[PDB]
Write a protein that holds these residues in place. Structure first.
Motif, PDB file in Angstrom:
ATOM      1  N   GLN A 176       3.374  17.577 -27.312  1.00 25.75           N
ATOM      2  CA  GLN A 176       3.703  18.971 -27.116  1.00 25.75           C
ATOM      3  C   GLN A 176       2.554  19.710 -26.426  1.00 25.75           C
ATOM      4  N   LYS A 177       1.306  19.392 -26.808  1.00 26.34           N
ATOM      5  CA  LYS A 177       0.153  19.968 -26.140  1.00 26.34           C
ATOM      6  C   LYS A 177       0.000  19.521 -24.680  1.00 26.34           C
ATOM      7  N   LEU A 178       0.220  18.245 -24.385  1.00 23.79           N
ATOM      8  CA  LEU A 178       0.276  17.776 -22.991  1.00 23.79           C
ATOM      9  C   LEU A 178       1.364  18.419 -22.175  1.00 23.79           C
ATOM     10  N   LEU A 179       2.539  18.584 -22.761  1.00 24.92           N
ATOM     11  CA  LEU A 179       3.625  19.251 -22.048  1.00 24.92           C
ATOM     12  C   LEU A 179       3.368  20.711 -21.732  1.00 24.92           C
ATOM     13  N   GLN A 180       2.510  21.412 -22.487  1.00 29.57           N
ATOM     14  CA  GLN A 180       2.286  22.853 -22.282  1.00 29.57           C
ATOM     15  C   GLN A 180       1.189  23.161 -21.243  1.00 29.57           C
ATOM     16  N   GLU A 181       0.368  22.171 -20.895  1.00 29.86           N
ATOM     17  CA  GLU A 181      -0.768  22.415 -20.000  1.00 29.86           C
ATOM     18  C   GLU A 181      -0.280  22.867 -18.599  1.00 29.86           C
ATOM     19  N   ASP A 182      -0.934  23.869 -18.025  1.00 34.29           N
ATOM     20  CA  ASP A 182      -0.566  24.338 -16.696  1.00 34.29           C
ATOM     21  C   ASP A 182      -0.866  23.217 -15.678  1.00 34.29           C
ATOM     22  N   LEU A 183       0.072  22.907 -14.790  1.00 31.02           N
ATOM     23  CA  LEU A 183      -0.219  21.995 -13.659  1.00 31.02           C
ATOM     24  C   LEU A 183       0.577  22.396 -12.403  1.00 31.02           C
ATOM     25  N   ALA A 184       0.161  21.898 -11.233  1.00 31.94           N
ATOM     26  CA  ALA A 184       0.853  22.176  -9.962  1.00 31.94           C
ATOM     27  C   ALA A 184       1.731  21.003  -9.535  1.00 31.94           C
ATOM     28  N   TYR A 185       3.003  21.294  -9.336  1.00 28.20           N
ATOM     29  CA  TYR A 185       3.969  20.277  -8.989  1.00 28.20           C
ATOM     30  C   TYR A 185       4.538  20.558  -7.599  1.00 28.20           C
ATOM     31  N   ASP A 186       4.180  19.764  -6.567  1.00 24.43           N
ATOM     32  CA  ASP A 186       4.756  19.799  -5.222  1.00 24.43           C
ATOM     33  C   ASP A 186       6.142  19.140  -5.185  1.00 24.43           C
ATOM     34  N   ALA A 187       6.702  19.320  -4.035  1.00 25.50           N
ATOM     35  CA  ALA A 187       8.033  18.721  -3.791  1.00 25.50           C
ATOM     36  C   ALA A 187       8.645  19.260  -2.492  1.00 25.50           C
TER      37      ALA A 187
ATOM     38  N   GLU B  53       1.934  12.221  -9.804  1.00 25.25           N
ATOM     39  CA  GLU B  53       1.124  13.395  -9.525  1.00 25.25           C
ATOM     40  C   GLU B  53       1.971  14.671  -9.443  1.00 25.25           C
ATOM     41  N   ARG B  54       3.222  14.561  -8.986  1.00 24.95           N
ATOM     42  CA  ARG B  54       4.072  15.765  -8.793  1.00 24.95           C
ATOM     43  C   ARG B  54       5.023  16.137  -9.949  1.00 24.95           C
ATOM     44  N   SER B  55       5.015  15.357 -11.036  1.00 24.04           N
ATOM     45  CA  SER B  55       6.012  15.426 -12.098  1.00 24.04           C
ATOM     46  C   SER B  55       5.383  15.783 -13.395  1.00 24.04           C
ATOM     47  N   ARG B  56       6.002  16.731 -14.060  1.00 22.09           N
ATOM     48  CA  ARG B  56       5.629  17.054 -15.429  1.00 22.09           C
ATOM     49  C   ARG B  56       5.847  15.880 -16.396  1.00 22.09           C
TER      50      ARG B  56
ATOM     51  N   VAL C 237      -0.908  12.380 -17.182  1.00 24.40           N
ATOM     52  CA  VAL C 237      -1.658  11.585 -18.180  1.00 24.40           C
ATOM     53  C   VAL C 237      -0.736  10.451 -18.611  1.00 24.40           C
ATOM     54  N   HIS C 238      -1.245   9.223 -18.600  1.00 28.49           N
ATOM     55  CA  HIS C 238      -0.484   8.088 -19.098  1.00 28.49           C
ATOM     56  C   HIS C 238      -0.378   8.182 -20.633  1.00 28.49           C
TER      57      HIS C 238
ATOM     58  N   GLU D 291       0.808  -1.202   0.000  1.00 22.25           N
ATOM     59  CA  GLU D 291       0.000   0.000   0.000  1.00 22.25           C
ATOM     60  C   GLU D 291       0.856   1.273   0.000  1.00 22.25           C
ATOM     61  N   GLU D 292       1.976   1.247   0.715  1.00 16.91           N
ATOM     62  CA  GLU D 292       2.864   2.410   0.772  1.00 16.91           C
ATOM     63  C   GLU D 292       3.647   2.606  -0.533  1.00 16.91           C
ATOM     64  N   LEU D 293       4.004   1.518  -1.206  1.00 18.38           N
ATOM     65  CA  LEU D 293       4.633   1.600  -2.530  1.00 18.38           C
ATOM     66  C   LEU D 293       3.697   2.210  -3.601  1.00 18.38           C
ATOM     67  N   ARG D 294       2.487   1.657  -3.694  1.00 19.00           N
ATOM     68  CA  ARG D 294       1.431   2.195  -4.553  1.00 19.00           C
ATOM     69  C   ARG D 294       1.310   3.684  -4.361  1.00 19.00           C
ATOM     70  N   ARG D 295       1.224   4.095  -3.098  1.00 23.74           N
ATOM     71  CA  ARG D 295       1.117   5.509  -2.756  1.00 23.74           C
ATOM     72  C   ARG D 295       2.313   6.356  -3.215  1.00 23.74           C
ATOM     73  N   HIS D 296       3.535   5.852  -3.068  1.00 24.45           N
ATOM     74  CA  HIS D 296       4.721   6.604  -3.507  1.00 24.45           C
ATOM     75  C   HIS D 296       4.794   6.714  -5.038  1.00 24.45           C
ATOM     76  N   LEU D 297       4.440   5.640  -5.717  1.00 21.90           N
ATOM     77  CA  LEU D 297       4.459   5.655  -7.194  1.00 21.90           C
ATOM     78  C   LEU D 297       3.464   6.683  -7.734  1.00 21.90           C
ATOM     79  N   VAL D 298       2.247   6.690  -7.180  1.00 16.56           N
ATOM     80  CA  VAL D 298       1.210   7.645  -7.553  1.00 16.56           C
ATOM     81  C   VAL D 298       1.668   9.047  -7.277  1.00 16.56           C
ATOM     82  N   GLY D 299       2.318   9.247  -6.135  1.00 19.63           N
ATOM     83  CA  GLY D 299       2.756  10.594  -5.737  1.00 19.63           C
ATOM     84  C   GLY D 299       3.828  11.128  -6.662  1.00 19.63           C
ATOM     85  N   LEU D 300       4.691  10.237  -7.103  1.00 24.38           N
ATOM     86  CA  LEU D 300       5.697  10.582  -8.081  1.00 24.38           C
ATOM     87  C   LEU D 300       5.040  11.136  -9.371  1.00 24.38           C
TER      88      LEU D 300
END
Ligand code: CL
Length: 108
Positions: free
Chosen positions: A97-108, A15-18, A79-80, A4-13
């Motif tokens: 290129q269109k996916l890369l340009q979309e505004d998103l919030a990246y924590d860290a 979610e936070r990455s362009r 997005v996968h 469960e903790e691995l699943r969570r870390h992979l998802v978090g990666l």
């Protein structure tokens, strides 16, 4: 369910990455996708499944999330995109290129 903790870390990666590329160090497909993003001046988070402890369990959980069994496995802005072929198709089509340009919030 498996880890469960691995699943969570992979998802978090993801979610936070362009861009996150789940890769292998020696793989030329992986190498090719990395080179594509580098050419586009795009910084990526890379997870080398052959270099992490319990990479087998990581690939298993990653197939559960993505319904994909092979590497490389690419996410752009949460997005996968898929494998190497699908990433080059996205490049050719303008999708990447269109996916890369979309505004998103990246924590860290
Ligand atoms: Cl191991």
């Amino acid at each position: 369910m498996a880890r469960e903790e691995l699943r969570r870390h992979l998802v978090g990666l993801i979610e936070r990455s362009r861009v996150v590329i789940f890769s292998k160090s020696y793989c030329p497909h992986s190498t090719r996708v990395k080179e594509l993003f580098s050419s586009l001046g795009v910084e990526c988070n890379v997870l080398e499944l052959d270099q992490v402890d319990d990479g087998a369990r990581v690939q298993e959980v990653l197939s559960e999330i993505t319904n994909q069994k092979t590497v490389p496995n690419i996410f752009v802005n949460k997005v996968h995109v898929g494998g190497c072929d699908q990433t080059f198709q996205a490049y050719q089509s303008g999708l990447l290129q269109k996916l890369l340009q979309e505004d998103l919030a990246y924590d860290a």
